[PDB]
């Protein structure tokens with residue numbers, strides 16, 4: 001039914017609006033819309049959005065999980081904390097560690113903007129907090145480039161995931177959870193926006209795209225991330241020269257890392273990072289396939305490619321999305337749809353994008369009822385998990401920067 005279509009499409013619909021100060025719109029970001037449509041019964045995509053409280057920037061992110069949702073969920077809830085901590089000066093690190101030790105009031109780090117369906121891990125909260133505390137203690141003892149902060153946050157979260165999987169936990173559920181997190185994988189495409197400065201750290205084949213309105217009113221897509229997959233020449237060459245000459249033919253086979261992985265960068269997936277001996281010892285330690293040509297590991301990295309963009313008055317919005325969207329529509333179509341929607345040319349841009357992606361026959365927003373009527377088993381035969389965040393910028397505030 002049409003109203004059933006609306007009920008299913010709007011189930012995960014979410015919107016946030018940056019509050020006005022003194023009755024005026026003062027942020028470079030007006031707000032954002034986000035939505036998810038699953039293809040797998042337990043959806044393996046994740047979305048996240050928060051505002052830094054000790055620093056000013058806002059973080060938004062999409063994460064495409066595979067081999068389960070454990071790693072996508074973990075990254076969804078931890079990466080922003082790692083980034084925030086990496087962005088803090090020594091003064092705030094000291095204050096946080098002192099409040100932790102002396103048991104005083106904890107300084108707040110992030111204000112999350114999460115749909116009710118989105119959740120944190122209750123059972124792992126203490127483990128995650130302990131790991132992040134170790135991280136910021138190391139940062140203290142080691143005593144502000146945003147690009148390098150993002151890179152180091154990504155790398156440290158991945159390394160902590162590996163170490164936690166190795167360490168286990170006395171609680172059986174926690175012990176199996178750390179292993180599930182390390183053994184599954186997740187992409188991560190994250191935007192950090194501080195006034196007019198926009199950084200995009202990308203790890204995998206999710207994508208961020210800027211919508212730019214030209215002087216004539218037409219719309220144009222500007223890429224802010226490079227899909228890390230077989231179609232990326234620089235990525236294939238990077239993989240090639242990261243290993244000896246004998247492996248130039250096997251590092252990428254059938255457009256896959258070692259003939260297996262579609263994304264060439266991701267969190268978790270320790271099967272492509274750990275040594276054969278470490279994998280064997282961990283598998284036999286408690287609660288199995290070694291990739292082919294696994295000679296000089298690691299082969300996979302979570303380290304992101306970081307792009308920087310100074311927002312301009314013509315930069316109207318930014319679309320973060322998993323490949324569940326980008327595989328369905330051309331970039332130009334995505335940005336044209338979103339721009340026409342936001343210019344009043346559905347009360348949620350991401351929901352409208354989903355409506356187009358699923359119910360499309362040369363852009364006719366029909367088969368939507370048929371596609372949304374399919375159960376878990378057949379849904380993944382026609383579509384992938386779809387996750388979208390549309391951030392709308394405040395062009396007046398952006399132009400105020402000059």
Ligand SMILES: [Mn+2]
Nearest residue numbers: 044064065066
């Ligand atoms: Mn996936």
Ligand SMILES: [Mn+2]
Nearest residue numbers: 064323324384
């Ligand atoms: Mn996907």
Ligand SMILES: [Mn+2]
Nearest residue numbers: 337352356365
């Ligand atoms: Mn439409």
